[model samples]
Target chain A: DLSFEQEFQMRVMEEQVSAMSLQEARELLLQASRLLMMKDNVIRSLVKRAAR
Target chain B: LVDLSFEQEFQMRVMEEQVSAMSLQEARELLLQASRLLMMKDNVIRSLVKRAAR
Candidate 1:
């Protein structure tokens, strides 16, 4: 069980995520994609080096 | 296009509900795990794309 403050904060956090604006959502999507691209780049570079 | 497939939309709403029910710390950990999964899948897709490009 959460303490009162924990409960309150959880509710607020849920509300924020649920109520996120389209721009915020788009930004988040872009951020996630960017992270994925970064991971892909790192792995691809390693693969390239290993192939040579 | 801003369209999400059924599974994509479903997963996101369920993620919201889970975060709502879990404690802050637990939710943070789960979100991190889920984010990593997305990244892994993203890498997998990139591989397929690389093949498809040929």
Candidate 2:
């Protein structure tokens, strides 16, 4: 029920956040911000590909 | 530094399925733990950012 950066964020949560360590959480947050920064681009590409 | 409500949400999402299997009172606690952890991390990141900005 997710798309764009949401899916990637979910994958990161499934993998990285499974461990409750400082490093893991920080990494996930960084990944989240990275996705956020490119949110528009990512979603457009996702939508275009899906439209095809 | 996170309050009760904040902590609970994080705990719940991280253990969403497990929390569901829990009994009424138990699930609430599980959710609380998740949200607490999330709030804690949120504060940690904020602190780090503030330091870097200084």
Candidate 3:
């Protein structure tokens, strides 16, 4: 199980994306992409677990 | 038996079904993803509306 701290970290990352300026939106696409990649990993893990 | 519309309730159930199929972790991930997409679309539509207003 992931900790509350990990969840908080994800929320903070999302909030940062939400508050981004247009210029920052462009720059932060990299960060958003990284977070999204992590999300996909988690989703795949859950799907695997559900299959069992 | 009454012939009545439960359209609002039915729509809510549809949304709930989508959300409930996910684990909490998955739901949170989707929340962020959806929020970003919704905000982006809202901004685009608002700009278009503003241009039409001019």
Candidate 4:
């Protein structure tokens, strides 16, 4: 299932997506996406579930 | 803005009401509603500022 990947990516995406100023937000998104792509499923799932 | 004490009281009332009256699903709905309200307020404030600049 794509559940794990979807769940993982959403967690990573939400952290970078804040209501901050545009430049700061963009930078956060860029860095988060880069780091997320390198992260293992365990780490991603842990963080996602932690936030819930 | 309103008085600081009043604001605090208002926030407390919201918390109290949510805790007393809302189920988990209702709380989630309230959160979504609050987010929408915040976004609308932000947009209104931004528009006001933009208009003032002209």
Candidate 5:
């Protein structure tokens, strides 16, 4: 079993997808992609700063 | 818009739960897998949009 917070998030996502339409899903995925990219960019920036 | 069924979409949450239950390294691997899938699907939709526009 997982922590309450993780399971809570999972439940929230489950409810979210149930109500989400195709357009909403596309939009949500797009947002998720951007978030992930933003995270990677920050990590790269940190690495570059550290290397310099 | 992509036309996936609700059941299929629910797998995302299922994967999330699986990720949450795994070790830190395993979760990181799964997140990488998820990001790769998202990128691939994003490209797929982009191509479809282009096709639909023509």
Candidate 6:
């Protein structure tokens, strides 16, 4: 099973992409980019904390 | 303008489930892959708009 955050991200992504108007798709991609970056940073911090 | 074909929609649903089942590491890598594609999409849009302005 996925984490709550993962589930949230996946759901948001699905809903965002499903409604694909011109600016809508663009916004979807922007949110996707933003989510991934935030996810990466969250994981990166976890790794750092674990290593220390 | 992009249109979704049936196959693509199916694939998206499949991947949605796949990601939900994925390990954190696997999901992270997949998301990274998706991020790169989004970046590429951004580039493609910019290029298309540039050409349209010409």
The best candidate in terms of lDDT: 1
Worst 10 residues of 2 chain A by lDDT: A33-42
The Cα error of candidate 1 at residue A19, in Å, is 22
Where is the poorest 10-residue window by lDDT in model 2 chain B? B27-36
Q: Scoring each candidate complex against the real one, what DockQ results? A: 0.05, 0.03, 0.03, 0.03, 0.03, 0.04
Give the poorly placed runs of model 5, Cα more than 4 Å off: A1-4, B1-54
Name the lDDT of candidate 1.
0.52
Report fnat, model 3: 0.01
Model 2 per-residue lDDT tens digits across residues B1-54: 222245444543554444334454443333334434444444455555565556
Model 1 segments beyond 4 Å from truth? A1-52, B6-11
TM-score of chain B of each: 0.65, 0.53, 0.60, 0.67, 0.65, 0.72
Give residue B2's lDDT in candidate 2 (0 to 100): 20
Q: Point out where model 3 deviates above 4 Å.
A: A1-52, B1-9
Q: Candidate 4 at residue B24, lDDT?
A: 44
lDDT of 6 by residue, A1-45 (tens): 344655576567655444444444443444564544444444444
| Model 4 residue A13 distance off true place after TM-score fit, in angstroms | 11
CAPRI-style grade of the A/B interface in model 1: incorrect
Cα lDDT, model 5, residue B24: 42
Better of 2 and 5 by TM-score: 5
Tens-place lDDT per residue, model 2, A16-48, is 345445434443443343333344333334345
Give the least accurate 10-residue stretch of model 6 chain A, judged by summed lDDT: A43-52
Assess each prediction's global lDDT (C-alpha) against the native.
0.52, 0.43, 0.49, 0.42, 0.49, 0.50
Model 6 bad stretches (over 4 Å)? A1-52, B1-3
Which candidate ranks first by DockQ, i.e. highest?
1
Chain A TM-scores for all candidates read 0.49, 0.40, 0.48, 0.40, 0.69, 0.57
Question: Which tens-of-lDDT digit does each residue in A1-52 have in candidate 4?
Answer: 2246545654554443433444444343333333323332323333444443
Candidate 4: chain B TM-score against the reference chain B:
0.67
- Pairs of residues at least 3 apart in sequence or in different chains that clash in candidate 1: none
Displacement of residue A38 (Cα, Å) in model 6 is 22
RMSD of each: 12.8, 15.4, 18.6, 19.2, 16.2, 16.7
**TM-score for each of the candidates:** 0.42, 0.33, 0.40, 0.41, 0.42, 0.45
